[PDB]
Scaffold this motif. Structure first.
Motif, PDB file in Angstrom:
ATOM      1  N   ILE A 187       0.854  24.845 -10.814  1.00 33.48           N
ATOM      2  CA  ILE A 187       1.568  25.046  -9.346  1.00 33.48           C
ATOM      3  C   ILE A 187       3.424  25.496  -9.729  1.00 33.48           C
ATOM      4  O   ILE A 187       3.857  24.724 -10.626  1.00 33.48           O
ATOM      5  CB  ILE A 187       1.270  23.569  -8.403  1.00 33.48           C
ATOM      6  CG1 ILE A 187       0.634  23.493  -7.986  1.00 33.48           C
ATOM      7  CG2 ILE A 187       3.234  23.885  -7.348  1.00 33.48           C
ATOM      8  CD1 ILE A 187      -0.132  24.332  -7.184  1.00 33.48           C
TER       9      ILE A 187
ATOM     10  N   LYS B 289       7.549  25.926  -9.299  1.00 31.02           N
ATOM     11  CA  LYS B 289       8.963  25.940  -8.216  1.00 31.02           C
ATOM     12  C   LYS B 289       9.914  27.118  -8.119  1.00 31.02           C
ATOM     13  O   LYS B 289      10.092  27.360  -9.384  1.00 31.02           O
ATOM     14  CB  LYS B 289       9.551  24.773  -8.628  1.00 31.02           C
ATOM     15  CG  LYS B 289       8.642  23.186  -8.466  1.00 31.02           C
ATOM     16  CD  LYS B 289       9.674  22.568  -8.627  1.00 31.02           C
ATOM     17  CE  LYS B 289       8.883  20.438  -8.065  1.00 31.02           C
ATOM     18  NZ  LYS B 289       8.646  19.870  -8.817  1.00 31.02           N
TER      19      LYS B 289
ATOM     20  N   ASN C 210       7.188  25.276  -3.755  1.00 31.66           N
ATOM     21  CA  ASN C 210       5.694  24.933  -4.668  1.00 31.66           C
ATOM     22  C   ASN C 210       4.779  25.625  -4.433  1.00 31.66           C
ATOM     23  O   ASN C 210       4.705  26.131  -3.071  1.00 31.66           O
ATOM     24  CB  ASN C 210       5.096  23.527  -4.745  1.00 31.66           C
ATOM     25  CG  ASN C 210       5.842  22.289  -4.658  1.00 31.66           C
ATOM     26  OD1 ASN C 210       6.532  22.433  -5.904  1.00 31.66           O
ATOM     27  ND2 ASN C 210       5.518  20.359  -4.450  1.00 31.66           N
TER      28      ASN C 210
END
Length: 146
Positions: A52, A54, A66
């Motif tokens: 993940i 950002k 995210n």
């Protein structure tokens, strides 16, 4: 030449992205001599088997989105969000999407502005059982809310 092989296409929104929305896309053609590719957000964290990344509001560091990377075309064994390299076909084209999974925002939702980060793409050769990184770049990436 990794710089010339890859392009990033931001998606522009008029309101907050929804779960599973595309934040940006990535297009590349594999140069001759490249056997495998890694494509992972910079500074990723593992969640539900996925890396993940950002995208952070460039004006307000407390607001961020995210996302994970999904392969949308091109042959090969890529699991959405994976960290490792995967074997690719030279002189063929690949596309990927950054898929929204959640984020940090105040109760009123996301502020208008640009949400930015970086995406690591690395190219490898695999010569006789040895994988060798031959090029890497952290590409600037973004999405916007008008």
């Amino acid at each position: 030449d990794i710089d010339s092989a890859v392009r990033i296409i931001p998606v522009n929104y008029d309101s907050d992205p929804k779960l599973n929305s595309q934040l940006y896309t990535v297009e590349m053609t594999i140069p001759a001599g490249v056997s495998a590719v890694k494509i992972v957000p910079t500074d990723s964290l593992t969640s539900s088997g996925q890396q993940i990344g950002k995208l952070v509001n460039v004006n307000n560091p407390d607001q961020n989105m995210n996302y994970y990377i999904r392969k949308d075309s091109g042959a090969g064994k890529f699991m959405a969000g994976q960290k490792g390299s995967f074997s690719v076909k030279e002189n063929t084209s690949y596309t990927f999407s950054a898929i929204y999974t959640g984020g940090e925002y105040p109760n009123s939702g996301y502020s208008s502005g640009t949400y930015a980060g970086h995406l690591t793409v690395s190219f490898y050769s695999n010569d006789n059982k040895q994988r060798t990184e031959i090029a890497t770049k952290n590409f600037p990436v973004s999405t916007t809310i008008s």
